[PDB]
Ligand binder design. Structure first.
Ligand SMILES: C=C[C@H]1CN(Cc2ccccn2)C(=O)[C@@H]2CCC[C@H]1N2[S@](=N)(=O)c1cc(Cl)cc(Cl)c1
Length: 128
Protein backbone atom coordinates (compact mmCIF):
# COMPACT_ATOMS: atom_id res chain seq x y z
CA UNK A 1 0.00 0.00 0.00
CA UNK A 2 0.98 3.65 0.10
CA UNK A 3 3.12 3.40 3.30
CA UNK A 4 5.15 0.55 1.86
CA UNK A 5 5.56 2.40 -1.42
CA UNK A 6 6.96 5.58 0.16
CA UNK A 7 9.19 3.43 2.40
CA UNK A 8 10.63 1.63 -0.63
CA UNK A 9 10.40 4.35 -3.30
CA UNK A 10 10.57 7.70 -1.44
CA UNK A 11 13.30 10.35 -1.59
CA UNK A 12 15.29 11.50 1.48
CA UNK A 13 14.53 15.22 2.12
CA UNK A 14 16.57 15.55 5.32
CA UNK A 15 19.56 17.89 5.66
CA UNK A 16 21.51 15.08 7.34
CA UNK A 17 20.65 12.48 4.63
CA UNK A 18 19.85 9.95 7.31
CA UNK A 19 16.66 8.78 5.58
CA UNK A 20 14.57 9.97 8.51
CA UNK A 21 11.99 11.65 6.25
CA UNK A 22 11.13 10.19 2.83
CA UNK A 23 8.81 11.86 0.35
CA UNK A 24 6.83 11.10 -2.82
CA UNK A 25 5.05 13.87 -4.67
CA UNK A 26 1.56 12.53 -5.52
CA UNK A 27 0.17 15.70 -7.23
CA UNK A 28 2.42 18.49 -8.56
CA UNK A 29 1.47 21.86 -7.18
CA UNK A 30 1.60 25.34 -8.63
CA UNK A 31 4.75 27.07 -9.89
CA UNK A 32 8.06 26.98 -8.02
CA UNK A 33 7.42 28.76 -4.71
CA UNK A 34 7.39 26.89 -1.38
CA UNK A 35 6.37 28.51 1.95
CA UNK A 36 8.89 30.36 4.10
CA UNK A 37 9.59 30.32 7.80
CA UNK A 38 6.74 31.94 9.70
CA UNK A 39 4.13 31.52 7.02
CA UNK A 40 0.67 30.53 8.13
CA UNK A 41 0.23 27.22 6.38
CA UNK A 42 -3.09 25.52 5.81
CA UNK A 43 -2.99 21.80 5.13
CA UNK A 44 -5.23 18.80 4.94
CA UNK A 45 -3.76 15.49 6.06
CA UNK A 46 -4.25 11.93 7.13
CA UNK A 47 -1.83 10.05 9.41
CA UNK A 48 -1.35 6.28 9.80
CA UNK A 49 0.68 4.17 12.19
CA UNK A 50 2.76 1.19 11.07
CA UNK A 51 0.04 -1.14 12.35
CA UNK A 52 -2.34 0.28 9.72
CA UNK A 53 -4.42 2.45 12.12
CA UNK A 54 -5.49 5.86 10.85
CA UNK A 55 -4.67 7.91 13.95
CA UNK A 56 -5.76 11.34 12.67
CA UNK A 57 -7.34 13.16 9.75
CA UNK A 58 -8.19 16.81 9.17
CA UNK A 59 -10.62 15.81 6.39
CA UNK A 60 -12.68 13.98 8.98
CA UNK A 61 -12.92 17.23 11.02
CA UNK A 62 -14.01 19.34 8.01
CA UNK A 63 -11.33 21.96 8.70
CA UNK A 64 -7.69 22.35 7.70
CA UNK A 65 -4.82 22.20 10.14
CA UNK A 66 -3.07 25.53 10.47
CA UNK A 67 0.40 26.17 11.82
CA UNK A 68 3.28 28.59 11.50
CA UNK A 69 6.02 26.97 9.42
CA UNK A 70 9.41 26.33 10.91
CA UNK A 71 8.52 27.48 14.47
CA UNK A 72 8.47 24.00 16.07
CA UNK A 73 4.68 23.94 16.47
CA UNK A 74 4.68 20.51 14.80
CA UNK A 75 6.96 17.50 14.60
CA UNK A 76 10.31 18.09 12.92
CA UNK A 77 9.36 16.11 9.81
CA UNK A 78 6.34 18.39 9.18
CA UNK A 79 8.40 21.54 9.45
CA UNK A 80 10.92 19.93 7.03
CA UNK A 81 8.35 18.32 4.73
CA UNK A 82 5.78 21.08 4.33
CA UNK A 83 8.65 23.47 3.59
CA UNK A 84 9.33 21.45 0.42
CA UNK A 85 5.74 21.64 -0.94
CA UNK A 86 4.17 23.93 -3.53
CA UNK A 87 0.66 25.31 -3.22
CA UNK A 88 -1.77 22.63 -4.27
CA UNK A 89 0.77 19.80 -3.93
CA UNK A 90 -0.19 16.47 -2.42
CA UNK A 91 2.70 14.46 -0.97
CA UNK A 92 3.34 11.34 1.09
CA UNK A 93 5.82 11.40 3.93
CA UNK A 94 7.34 8.39 5.73
CA UNK A 95 8.84 9.54 9.00
CA UNK A 96 11.15 7.73 11.39
CA UNK A 97 10.60 8.39 15.10
CA UNK A 98 13.64 10.67 15.41
CA UNK A 99 11.75 13.21 13.26
CA UNK A 100 8.41 12.65 15.03
CA UNK A 101 7.69 11.53 18.67
CA UNK A 102 10.78 9.43 19.40
CA UNK A 103 10.89 6.99 22.39
CA UNK A 104 8.30 9.11 24.25
CA UNK A 105 5.49 8.69 21.75
CA UNK A 106 2.45 10.83 22.42
CA UNK A 107 -0.29 9.49 24.64
CA UNK A 108 -2.72 8.12 23.88
CA UNK A 109 -2.53 7.82 20.07
CA UNK A 110 1.15 7.47 19.16
CA UNK A 111 3.23 4.50 20.52
CA UNK A 112 6.92 4.70 21.41
CA UNK A 113 9.36 4.34 18.54
CA UNK A 114 6.64 4.90 15.94
CA UNK A 115 7.34 5.32 12.23
CA UNK A 116 4.53 7.48 10.80
CA UNK A 117 2.93 7.84 7.39
CA UNK A 118 1.17 11.01 6.24
CA UNK A 119 -0.64 12.17 3.15
CA UNK A 120 -0.50 16.00 3.14
CA UNK A 121 -2.10 18.55 0.85
CA UNK A 122 -0.76 22.10 1.02
CA UNK A 123 -3.85 24.33 0.60
CA UNK A 124 -2.37 27.77 1.09
CA UNK A 125 0.47 29.65 2.70
CA UNK A 126 0.48 33.31 3.67
CA UNK A 127 2.21 35.92 5.78
CA UNK A 128 5.72 36.24 7.17
C1 LIG B 1 -3.75 18.41 14.99
C2 LIG B 1 -2.55 18.00 15.82
C3 LIG B 1 -1.10 17.96 15.27
C4 LIG B 1 -0.23 17.63 16.51
N1 LIG B 1 1.21 17.92 16.33
C5 LIG B 1 1.86 18.87 17.35
C6 LIG B 1 1.69 18.38 18.67
C7 LIG B 1 1.29 19.23 19.72
C8 LIG B 1 1.11 18.74 21.00
C9 LIG B 1 1.36 17.41 21.27
C10 LIG B 1 1.78 16.58 20.23
N2 LIG B 1 1.95 17.08 18.93
C11 LIG B 1 1.94 17.45 15.28
O1 LIG B 1 3.11 17.84 15.25
C12 LIG B 1 1.53 16.50 14.25
C13 LIG B 1 1.70 17.01 12.87
C14 LIG B 1 0.63 18.07 12.61
C15 LIG B 1 -0.79 17.48 12.85
C16 LIG B 1 -0.95 16.91 14.18
N3 LIG B 1 0.16 15.99 14.53
S1 LIG B 1 -0.14 14.34 14.36
N4 LIG B 1 1.12 13.66 14.37
O2 LIG B 1 -1.11 14.06 13.24
C17 LIG B 1 -1.05 13.91 15.83
C18 LIG B 1 -2.39 13.56 15.76
C19 LIG B 1 -3.09 13.22 16.94
CL1 LIG B 1 -4.71 12.79 16.90
C20 LIG B 1 -2.41 13.20 18.14
C21 LIG B 1 -1.07 13.55 18.21
CL2 LIG B 1 -0.19 13.51 19.67
C22 LIG B 1 -0.39 13.88 17.05
Amino acid sequence: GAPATVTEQGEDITSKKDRGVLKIVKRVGNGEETPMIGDKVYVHYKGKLSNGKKFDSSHDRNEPFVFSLGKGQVIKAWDIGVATMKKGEIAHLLIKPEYAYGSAGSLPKIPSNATLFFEIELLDFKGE
